[PDB]
Design a protein around this ligand. Structure first.
Ligand code: 7V1
Ligand code: B7G
Ligand code: B7G
Length: 270
């Protein structure tokens, strides 16, 4: 009985995911491998191709919108910020499409997103990443990892650890239906500081994890240890975000000319 109920639960979480996320891992890998399209992403690998992309790529955020121009490395950081805020919006709608999330009081919803979105972002990031770079502008562009490594500190350093995590994460070969459950488990996390109804969130988190575990038994029947492996990734994501926050703190202290989106400021506020 347990197994059958969880299967319907996982399907509703998967529908929430399909309804709300801009791009699926299925779509991303088809672009990154080159099978899908009559057109390939524009490759951004240096200043000239970045400039050409800003001139000719369609970006969710108009360039004129980004904070005033400062320099190549900050400009790139502003696009990272713009896409992060866009992904917070999507993750917020994903969570609200999960009834047990929407049944929580609104202040606990905020606490869960506050301390969960960056873990979920960096997990979902792996879907648009390969070892050579990542997709941008809805799959219109591909920014090489080498280019991002060429940016000056501290902007290059905040970027490379995410690639390291993503490449290892992609070798577990999760599909979008796995990720929907994995991301939901990250958001509904009973450990977040200042949660009001902890036992409620813990019970939801436990339900998602049981669903996840049964989900991988059907969808990945030959992958030994894959469920405990994903629990370790969820611990690894906390450490990745702790370091990310530390690096963001340094950027705030030493890059005083770089502006930070106020919503992200609220997230880091502690
Ligand atoms: C995660 C995801 C949303 N990113 C950002 C990203 C990817 C990998 C590593 C790090 C990183 O962001 C670190 C700074 C984040 C600050 C905000 C915060 O903490 O809230 C991207 O999709 C992205 C990457 C590169 C570009 C880009 C356009 C032009 C040339 O390059 C555009 C978007
Ligand atoms: C259900 C709507 C009514 C909600 C009223 C309760 C709001 O409490 C506030 O919730 C925030 C976490 O989200 C915390 O940051 C604040 O410290 C806390 O004071
Ligand atoms: C769109 C959902 C994601 C929002 C993430 C940002 C949360 O910021 C927090 O908002 C609370 C008010 O609700 C304040 O009480 C906290 O001091 C602040 O840290």
């Amino acid at each position: 009985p347990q197994v059958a109920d969880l299967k319907a639960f996982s399907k509703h979480i998967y529908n929430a995911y399909l309804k709300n996320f801009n791009m699926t891992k299925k779509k991303a890998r088809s672009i990154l491998t080159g099978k899908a399209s009559h057109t390939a992403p524009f490759v951004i690998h240096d200043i000239e191709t970045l400039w050409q992309a800003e001139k000719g790529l369609v970006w969710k955020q108009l360039v004129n919108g980004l904070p005033p121009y400062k320099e190549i490395s900050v400009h790139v950081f502003y696009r990272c910020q713009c896409t992060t805020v866009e992904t917070v919006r999507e993750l917020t709608e994903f969570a609200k499409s999960i009834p047990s999330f929407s049944s929580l009081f609104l202040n606990d919803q905020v606490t869960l997103l506050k301390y969960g979105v960056h873990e979920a972002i960096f997990a979902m990031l792996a879907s648009i990443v390969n070892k050579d770079g990542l997709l941008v502008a809805n799959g219109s562009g591909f920014v090489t990892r080498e280019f991002l490594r060429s940016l000056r500190k501290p902007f290059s350093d905040i970027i490379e650890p995410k690639f390291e995590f993503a490449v290892k994460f992609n070798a577990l070969e999760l599909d979008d239906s796995d990720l929907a459950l994995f991301i939901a488990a990250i958001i509904l996390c009973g450990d977040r500081p200042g949660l009001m109804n902890v036992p409620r969130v813990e019970a939801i988190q436990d339900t998602i994890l049981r669903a996840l575990e049964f989900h991988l038994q059907a969808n990945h029947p030959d992958a030994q240890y894959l469920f405990p492996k994903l629990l370790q990734k969820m611990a690894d994501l906390r450490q990745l975000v702790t370091e990310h926050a530390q690096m963001m703190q340094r950027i705030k202290k030493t890059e005083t000319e770089t502006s930070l989106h106020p919503l992200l400021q609220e997230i880091y506020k502690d």
